[PDB]
Amino acid sequence: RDNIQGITKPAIRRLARRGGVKRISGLIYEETRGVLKVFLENVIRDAVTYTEHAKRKTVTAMDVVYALKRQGRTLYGFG
Amino acid sequence: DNIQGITKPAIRRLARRGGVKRISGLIYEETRGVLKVFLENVIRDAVTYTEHAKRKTVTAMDVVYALKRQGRTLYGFG
Amino acid sequence: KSRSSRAGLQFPVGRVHRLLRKGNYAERVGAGAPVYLAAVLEYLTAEILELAGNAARDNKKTRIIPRHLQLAIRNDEELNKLLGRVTIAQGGVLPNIQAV
Amino acid sequence: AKSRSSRAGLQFPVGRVHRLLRKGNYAERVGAGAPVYLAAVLEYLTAEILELAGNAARDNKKTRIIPRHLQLAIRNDEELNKLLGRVTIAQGGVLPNIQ
Amino acid sequence: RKESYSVYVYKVLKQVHPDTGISSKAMGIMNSFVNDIFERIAGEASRLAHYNKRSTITSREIQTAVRLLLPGELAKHAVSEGTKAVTKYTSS
Amino acid sequence: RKESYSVYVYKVLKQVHPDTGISSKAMGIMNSFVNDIFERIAGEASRLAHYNKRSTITSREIQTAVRLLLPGELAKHAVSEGTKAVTKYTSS
Amino acid sequence: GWLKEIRKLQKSTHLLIRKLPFSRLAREICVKFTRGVDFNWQAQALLALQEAAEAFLVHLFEDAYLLTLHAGRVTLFPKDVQLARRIRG
Amino acid sequence: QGWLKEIRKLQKSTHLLIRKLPFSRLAREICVKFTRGVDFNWQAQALLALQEAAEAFLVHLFEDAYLLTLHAGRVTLFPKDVQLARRIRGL
DNA sequence: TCAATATCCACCTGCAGATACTACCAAAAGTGTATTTGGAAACTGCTCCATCAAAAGGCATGTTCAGCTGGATTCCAGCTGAACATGCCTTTTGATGGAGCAGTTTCCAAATACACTTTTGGTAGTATCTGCAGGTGGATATTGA
DNA sequence: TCAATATCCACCTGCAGATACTACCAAAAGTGTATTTGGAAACTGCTCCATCAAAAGGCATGTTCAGCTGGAATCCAGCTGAACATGCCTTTTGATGGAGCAGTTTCCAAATACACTTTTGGTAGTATCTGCAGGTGGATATTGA
């Protein structure tokens, strides 16, 4: 266990299929994990800054939304 | 014309600066089209910024603000 | 005697005024700005809701859910351009398969 | 009598930064130490870029900086390029890159 | 203590689709939609007044911001609606 | 009537590269550089104070904005410099 | 058949990664920026992060499978994921 | 050869590659279709700004698109490459 | 391999444009000082909602196979680049007026403050009712032949 | 094309989780009336720079040929998907804290106004000097031999 091997092959296969992908190489399951780790690092770093500024020990949804909005990604359904 | 003044050699030079070795003969029309599309979007935003102020001369700052809107910040003119 | 009624609107003109005043957008705010903006917001709201209700009808349902909003937005050329850097929770994707 | 850039130990202006923060509709009030911090940051970044650009100028055997040199500096650095990736430098050209 | 746009969304919905409801997850999306466009338009209107050295935001700034943000026919109709609203607000 | 940052850029240059000049086209680029970063940092500092219901911009807001905008080691050094500046400003 | 699974997964909207693994990973990443402190996480924050991540990955897969076909293939390679990220910026 | 010398020469330089009068003429022709049929005047620095931005755009697009010819095992630039680059960028 | 031809590379000369320097000045912008005021830090405290364990069953893991696809090779015809001779369109230069920009009035519209009425958000306790899950019946395409 | 099997649609029933509807309330907020103030529109004038002409020659255009490359057809071996049996990790539930959020106080840092230096931007005028273009002159690879 390494906490990123919990992102399994079937889940990645499902995301690919929802993306229209017919066949998948066996080297796609490690590449995807790195991509995901980079994305999460970038978002979480900014989320933690917003909440440490406010002198809290609890990450809220607004902190995540603000971080994403910075990164160029705007998410609606939350508040 | 006025889009055929963007010549074959000019496009070929722009391609070479980008590292292109060979170039199909149909690239000269495609480039012209995409350029014509790029200018339309910038120019109307510039003209809007220019008309909000009540003047009839397009300044460099209007172009800079337009590009900044499009996400294409430019350094050198303001 | 309300401002939204004088203008023929359902959206709030006073609240928009207060939010413009408190947001550090300018040192002053005029009287037609809130009504103009409220009307624009109402137009866009209704324009989306119409298409979402149509999509619900096509799916044989009487209640709108985020899937319907996503379909409305992504099947309309202009709303997609306006909302192209946006992801909608519980919306999914448009079906799309292609031959090689 | 004494300026504030000198107390802080800076070349950039602390009064002008204060003025621009107050006149920019950024907030109702502006503290005493914000302009100092911001001026220091701006000075640091300017100095970094100018150092790299002067080095690039010397490599090319020139005594004067021109936009080409700033472009080379910025695109040869892994961080300044990330800060300035949506930016085009007038009369700067491109990095030589074949293949 | 908390405030939202749900009342007015529900009114507009009953005005275009009288037979049709809306779930709670979706109205969150719509509330987020309204807050985003407000911010964009008001942000552009803030700059136009700064670029031109003005201390007041008027309907002209909002109109220009609408033209800049919104694409094509959508801006046209939005401008028409806002102009009518102001026109019949003033005449009362 | 017009104002700029050229004086201070020239000072910094004579402070890092005493033998080296700068052309007029390039100093325009540098002036544009300084105006852009100012706007970004002050914009972020404006929001953090709004998110947390504060009416005052302080050095803490600028510090947090610096951390958010700038990447990696560059933010680290910028924070160090700003902190030193404030420290020796207060002690006078 | 791949065709039935694609059609089924494009009509659906539910999340595809399981919750606890994602939560564990996101908390493992957080603790590096907080200098040893175990921050708490609202429940509606992890769902937000998950929605965003899954959207990102799906759209990336679309863009990359556009590049497999450009090359005359049917099979997705890492070769094709890397190039899409470069072009997107 | 001749292509390699030209590539090396052109990447080493900074000057504009499109001629000025044609670009001016096209930009004015495009402006007139807005403005409700009236001819606006233009500062010179404005046209230079627009030209710099346009040439940058095109050079960067050619760069991004010659990566898709080599992906497909080719050496020759085709239009499908430009189209796909624009699609993937989001334009 | 040889090598003249480009070609590269270095080096020197001259000069023209652009840089840097000095002096004047004046204005507008920043500093110092004293007063008053209001935002935010510090400390209490309470209720919500986050975290920690546990029990089980549903999804994932591992192995084998065979059918499909990726990748290398060969061949041939289409199409690109290079070279050379014309000449047409861009570039540079100069008199001219239209529009941007500054200054002065004033007047219309926005801020400030107090009273009063209306609206909206939240809770209690309902009552529907829409949509999902399971069950069953009828009907077709594709697997293999 | 034959055909059974999934699979595809459609209809049905049941139910329960979530949406609409009332009450009510009371707190917050919006509206109406006077009053004061100042920001921006309207008018005039001025001078700067942007449009509009006319010569000169340097880059673009057209034709032809040789060779390079794209594309189609074979073929072979690697490798991905599908199926089945099994078991481990995730999901659901219930129980406590601990941290967020609201409240009160006060004190320290910010706005405000006035008087006084100082610094920076612009303008002549000076000169000087960096680098670009030119040409000499030495020396290397290169595709045809």
Numbering used by the authors:
A (entry chain B): 23 to 101
B (entry chain F): 24 to 101
C (entry chain G): 15 to 114
D (entry chain C): 14 to 112
E (entry chain H), F (entry chain D): 33 to 124
G (entry chain A): 46 to 134
H (entry chain E): 45 to 135
Q: Paper's wording?
A:
As one of two pillars for kinetochore assembly at the centromere, CENP-N recognizes the CENP-A nucleosome through its amino-terminal region, while forming a heterodimer with CENP-L through its carboxy-terminal region to recruit other CCAN proteins. Here we demonstrate that the human CENP-A-interacting protein CENP-N promotes the stacking of CENP-A-containing mononucleosomes and nucleosomal arrays through a previously undefined interaction between the α6 helix of CENP-N with the DNA of a neighboring nucleosome. Overall, our data suggest that CENP-N, as one of the key proteins of the inner kinetochore, stabilizes, organizes, and compacts centromeric chromatin in a way that depends on its specific interaction with CENP-A nucleosomes and on its DNA-directed interactions with a neighboring nucleosome.
In the cryo-EM images, we consistently observed that ~30% of CENP-A nucleosomes form ordered stacks on the grid in the presence of CENP-N, ranging from 2–10 nucleosomes. By focusing single-particle analysis on nucleosome pairs contained in these stacks, defined density for CENP-N was observed between two nucleosomes in the two-dimensional (2D) class averages for nucleosomes reconstituted on either DNA fragment. After three-dimensional (3D) reconstruction and refinement, we obtained cryo-EM maps in which one or two CENP-N1–289 could be unambiguously docked between two CENP-A nucleosomes. a, A model of two CENP-A nucleosomes (α satellite DNA) connected by two copies of CENP-N was fit into the density map.
